[PDB]
């Protein structure tokens with residue numbers, strides 16, 4: 001018999017209460033490789049309103065890490081070890097990995113995971129209003145994967161960041177619609 | 178060479194007030210076997226299935242998981258949804274019906290060519306207990322906590338080969 005996926009019963013039967021040893025675990029980051037941190041920084045801060053928590057450089061290994069999150073910049077400790085302990089204990093951060101030199105390599109780009117080979121699909125951002133969010137996006141020149149009133153599910157948008165990664169733009173109080 | 182701090186910082190804008198209450202809601206991974214995947218993230222990693230949405234028309238299911246007490250999950254089917262998509266730091270797992278039965282099928286983890294997405298990462302109080310327990314349960318490892326230069330940090334794999342990083346935020350500054 002063909003897969004018609006799991007019933008909710010099979011689904012929840014596979015689910016377990018968290019072992020108590022896991023009770024302070026925290027989903028801390030999603031890492032995406034980025035070609036140009038100038039574009040990506042502009043994009044995430046100026047377009048989507050994230051804040052740059054910390055920039056870490058690895059000279060020996062030739063990359064930097066940029067952690068972005070929705071956090072007030074006045075909360076960031078300014079001292080390096082204190083910044084670090086604070087950043088890595090934030091929930092929901094983006095870690096953008098810049099392998100140095102990819103910005104000036106015109107033969108290099110990353111793969112967004114949405115065409116062969118497929119894997120990762122997107123990150124997603126909850127907004128209060130998708131239609132003003134998207135109208136604002138149009139005004140600033142964001143490439144769209146899906147306009148909110150386009151395609152099948154109206155009220156749901158997918159935009160792209162400067163590397164092509166998909167970003168769902170979503171209204172949590174109108175998803176069940 | 179890399180960007181200097183000054184170039185990087187000068188590419189950062191303050192958030193437009195328009196973006197007030199935007200929140201980083203979800204990261205989506207395509208998964209081969211939702212039985213394996215749900216068992217892993219709940220039993221092994223301690224996350225909680227918040228909701229399941231099915232779409233028979235396109236032959237796919239979505240599973241949402243977060244570190245959340247199941248006693249906050251509104252029972253009301255309309256209000257459960259609203260709550261779920263309002264939680265921060267969620268995983269949307271996407272099962273395309275069929276794939277669990279096709280031995281030729283696996284997803285790409287983004288860590289070999291063509292590279293992209295790299296990993297998710299989980300903040301833990303103690304990487305060694307965490308991993309000792311992962312090892313005990315048969316979790317497959319990329320980097321064990323003692324392996325390599327960065328000791329105190331691990332990478333494990335989920336049932337799809339997606340790399341999950343394990344770190345202690347209090348130890349990061351020493352490690353690096």
Ligand SMILES: O=C(O)Cc1nn(Cc2nc3cc(C(F)(F)F)ccc3s2)c(=O)c2ccccc12
Pocket residue numbers: 031033061063097099295319320325
């Ligand atoms: O990923 C990038 O784009 C850059 C990159 N490189 N490296 C160096 C590596 N150390 C490894 C160790 C193993 C090992 F198998 F030995 F564990 C396997 C693979 C690797 S890559 C990282 O450690 C890393 C961590 C976060 C973000 C980006 C990177």
Ligand SMILES: [Zn+2]
Pocket residue numbers: 029031095296298342
């Ligand atoms: Zn990482």
Ligand SMILES: [Zn+2]
Pocket residue numbers: 122124168203205269
């Ligand atoms: Zn999604």
